[PDB]
Structures are given as structure tokens and as C-alpha cells.
Subunit: 21 residues, 12 copies
């Protein structure tokens, strides 16, 4: 599958996360 | 415009946000 | 099917609408 | 992550569900 | 238009459906 | 950014709007 | 709702169509 | 890459096409 | 939920996969 | 396939482009 | 919110930008 | 056009690919 990357800033901290589809 | 609603969740808490198109 | 929830806004007045799939 | 919501309907049975991204 | 396909499952009952755009 | 165009038909009027990404 | 416009060339002829969401 | 399938329909006929991401 | 159909391809070899919603 | 249209901007040198699906 | 990243090109003057959701 | 990036994990290997819109 494809893994997109986004900075999840919804949490207090910002963190790079993968988004797998 | 269209307004979609989503919970913006973090490491612990979440908040209702609008997503406008 | 899935029914997504959205608000159709315009002229400072919104209305709940469904979006079906 | 973001949590969207949808009404998942089958055979006259519907239940709100989350969809996490 | 384009016609996508999905398996719509409810309570152990699934049926292929079209989704037209 | 890409500027898509859509007709936003609210309640009192429609209007060609931009939607930039 | 929003009405997007696309040239539907899937048909032999190409034609502007609306896509309502 | 991911390959989605759709019927590319016209005024009369349709054809299976791939949509690659 | 909806189950979308896709092929995961790579190195000249694809495999059917589901994508659930 | 469907052909959407967008204004592709770059340092404010926008122009109409097609986006095929 | 989530922040995706893309290379926004214009006459081949690409640069990284954020795309917030 | 915007160039998004994703990790395309097939069967023999992953690889950072582009996906331009
Ligand atoms: C800003 O442009 C985003 C395009 O960049 C892509 C790299 C984004 O990648 C995707 C995987 C992540 O996109 C997010 C879902 C946010 O974008 C979508 C378009 C949100 O759009 C909203 C306005 C749509 O509102 C409702 C219909 C929510 O719809 C979501 C997308 C339904 O959930 C999806 C189908 C579940 O994800 C797929 C699963 C198999 N991983
Ligand atoms: C090229 O960028 C497209 C973004 O421009 C927008 C103006 C497009 O507008 C939308 C309304 C039309 O987009 C078409 C559906 C094609 O784009 C989508 C992203 C096709 O993507 C494929 C690869 C996804 O494959 C499966 C999951 C098919 O998913 C479709 C989108 C599911 O059907 C949708 C949710 C039904 O449409 C919504 C309905 C309420 N009108």
C-alpha cells in the first residue's frame, strides 16, 4: 500500500505520522 | 460552502473542528 | 450505504444535509 | 488524527461510526 | 461518467453496488 | 497552488467560487 | 451544494457536465 | 502503485479502465 | 461498511486488496 | 475519462490546466 | 489538524509547501 | 502542479515515489 506522511499537529505536540492506504 | 465536522484528537484530548469547502 | 454529515452554508445560514455513499 | 463520522446503514439498521485518519 | 464499485455490507449481508460520477 | 472552481448554491444565490489547494 | 464542472470525454463526444455534491 | 477500476461509460457504451495512483 | 476494490501492484505483480470504510 | 480544470499558479503566473481522471 | 507536504511547481520553480486539514 | 510524496511498498521493495497533480 501507499504511505502518506503528515505532521499531526492536532495533538499538542506536532509529530510526523504515516497514513497507510 | 460545505462544512464537514471532525474530532481533532491529540495524545489525550479531542476537539470538534469544521472543515470548510 | 454510508451517510456523511455536512452543513450547507450560505448568507450566514446553514442547514444539515446528508451525503450518501 | 482526525475522526470523521458517518451513519452506516444496512437493512433498516443504522449506527454512527468513526472514521479515523 | 465513471462508475466505481464497492461491496456494501450490513449485518452479514453484502451486495456489490455502483457509484457513479 | 491549484485553483479549482465550483458553483456554490446556498439559499439566496449561487456564485462561482474558488477553491485553491 | 457545490457543483463542479468537468468535460466528460468518456463518451465518444466530449461534453461539459456538472458534478453536484 | 494502487490500481482502482471503473467503468468509463458514454452516451451508450462503457469500458473498463484503470486508475493508477 | 463499504469495501472498495483495488490492486496493489509493484515489480510487475499485482494483488487484489480491499479498502474498507 | 473526466477532465477537471484548475488555475495552476506559480509566482502569480496562473494558467488553466486539465486534470484527467 | 494534519499537515501534508507537496512540491508546488511553477515554470520549474518548485518549493515545499504545507497543506493543512 | 503539486507533487505529493508517498512510500510505495509493493512486494520486493518500498520506494519514495511522486504523485503530481
Ligand atoms: C489537501 O489535499 C489532500 C490530498 O492529499 C492526499 C495525500 C491526502 O491523503 C489522504 C489519504 C488523506 O486525506 C484526508 C482523508 C483528508 O482529505 C480528505 C479529502 C478530507 O476531505 C473531507 C472534506 C471529506 O469529508 C468527508 C467525506 C470525509 O471523507 C473521508 C476522506 C472519508 O474517509 C476516508 C475514505 C478513509 O480513508 C481511507 C482509508 C482506507 N485509509
Ligand atoms: C484530480 O483531482 C480531483 C479533485 O478535484 C475535485 C474538483 C474533484 O471533485 C470530485 C467531486 C470528483 O472527483 C472524482 C470522484 C474523482 O476523484 C476521486 C478522488 C477518485 O479517486 C479514486 C482514485 C478513489 O477511488 C475510489 C475510492 C473511488 O472513490 C470515489 C471518490 C468514491 O465516490 C465518491 C465518494 C462519491 O462522490 C460523492 C457523491 C456524494 N457525489
Amino acid at each position: 500500500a501507499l504511505v502518506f506522511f503528515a505532521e499531526d499537529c492536532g495533538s499538542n505536540k506536532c509529530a510526523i505520522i504515516g497514513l497507510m492506504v
